[model samples]
Target: AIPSSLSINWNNYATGAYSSGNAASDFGNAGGWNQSRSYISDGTLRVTLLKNALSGAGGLISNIDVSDGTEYELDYDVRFHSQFDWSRGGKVGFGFSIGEGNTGGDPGWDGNGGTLRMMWYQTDAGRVFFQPYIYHKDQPGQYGDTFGKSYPSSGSITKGTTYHVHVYIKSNTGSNRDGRAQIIINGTTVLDTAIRWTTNDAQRLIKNMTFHTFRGGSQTYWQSPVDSYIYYDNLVLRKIRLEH
Candidate 1:
């Protein structure tokens, strides 16, 4: 089971059209992308959170709506600069997901959530952790169970350095907890485990590949550093795992 050809690079203006929505219009004005925070001199997609709110999410979402039976993987290069951490009350990073629909109506951050997501966060322990999360829900915006486990980074995350992240997600058979998810960073597998992604009542399909990054909660503290940004480029997607 492999995915078909898929690639997204903000550097190529022609491809931006592949995304169906952005943070301002579709996601409740959370954050957005452009050349201002470009990774490359020309323009790499820069994901930045504008305000401090759960509804404040910004990034590009793919128009493709994928179903079960086939495995999918996402590969991309990203760099985070400035002071933003889980302890600091903000979040950043990207991943592919499934929502209730394929159109722009998809929920914003933590909106109905997603089956598989990879995020970079700062912990209260003062460590940067790479986390892989799974949401099990019978319907959108509601989760019977959600799994979020973090793996602390072995080395310090510096600004302006490109980091490669690869993620793979596949549906579990039946109602069993055999679903699988993996996260690889800089060529090392940080997480490889079994996941029970679906309930008997729900076989969530992939609605969009989201570049969601933001800072917010009810508290006034969860906002990211003003003007801090993350840059992503060389995005590659596959239906099958590219490496063991």
Candidate 2:
């Protein structure tokens, strides 16, 4: 059944008028890294990471405000173009995040309560199934900590195939460790477990849903073979919970 949530259909956008920040009506930062780099073209939202640029990341975030004690889920469709290389290792994909002090770039990339990202990692042979993680800074201006998990894949990612991805997160309340997370890819469940995503004093809740396509980890050797890019469509960010 179709879930209840805020949905963005690229086909609904008028070809020429849709640009990154122009989507401000629906999102906080439509243009994540470069204001002109992210936009809808030919009925799909395209986010690109230049071949050799070190900090090339771009995407969008919902402008809505959410609080704690509620459940949230993000559903979206992503397609990697021919320029994508499974052998280049860094990061690429989409996910949801929550925190404070987020700007136009990666929702939780800078650090606040934390940013939970689920992405496709390129390795030596092929791409890893997916990396589901949470990165945050406990103190001001500190390097912070990261918690993550990897799922196994049966096959490599095809160049032009569209894949369905879904992620669900519930905030932990009262310090009893009630927070939870779950992920699904192409109808297959990948990871599901209990989590404590934030501290009680910070009062963190689900905030933005981000579209991130980036490459990092190596200061110099990691670059896309071609101008790496990905296409996104049918995005839905729902404020709802589900049965186990």
Candidate 3:
């Protein structure tokens, strides 16, 4: 079962694995995922930015372990410290088993250039999970479309601001793999949908089996030299606080 709550202190626990403001991780050469130097200070576990945001190809918090066919919720409070440009295609998100580490190119959605962001992801056939959200520049809250639904984002993110985010997933089994997911931002349910479960299958599930990894500036998102700073805190993972 996922924990009801999971948290860390930026001053105490974060070790700068993915933060742009602090010093770089000493372990980058050590080849292991340790969160000792991955945090920044704001009196909490949130990251601090000095110049830009952070990126990862196995940096800071690398990956996590997850079970298939379970329902879980992940919550955190994110404050856009500075730099409210989403058109540049920067991303900060939570998921399992991210890119294959330094693969030159990773596949997924990067909000097309806005500031504020909130998203929910689903997997089909087990391994491929895609996100749908409203990016700052996307008009009228568009969802996403490689060739699917087209929901869009509808707002802007101000620098030095904070927002509470929540993501939920209900993994089931049936046609198209069967599952459901939802998202809530600052106490509002921005997204809630019953979608197909394609992530926990065999080949795909192997690709999505890390525990909890955070990626800040994905070069794949077109943010180069990778530097965008942000902080994360008050992390809570829930597997079913309520059941029928």
Give the number of the best model, judged by TM-score: 2
Cα lDDT of model 2 by residue, 1-244, tens digit: 2223567767877655355455654553443445455667678777666665544532223233333324788788888777565444444455555556333333333334555566666666654556665553332323222234455446555768788888887765544457766777788777677665555435456655555566654455665555666777887777775322
lDDT by residue (tens digit), candidate 1, 27-109? 22222343222233235666544443342443232234333333677888877655533435333454556444221223222
TM-score of each: 0.66, 0.74, 0.55
- What is candidate 2's CA lDDT for residue 72? 84
List ranges where model 3 is wrong by over 4 Å: 1-5, 9-37, 46-61, 67-69, 83-87, 96-153, 176-178, 199-221, 224-226, 241-244
Error of 3 at 170 (Å): 1.0
- Native-vs-model 3 lDDT? 0.38
Q: Any runs in candidate 1 off by more than 4 Å, and if so which?
A: 1-4, 13-41, 51-54, 57-69, 82-91, 99-114, 137-152, 201-204, 240-244
| Ranked candidates, highest TM-score first | 2, 1, 3
Relative to the true structure, how large is the alpha-carbon lDDT of every model? 0.50, 0.57, 0.38
Better of 1 and 3 by TM-score: 1
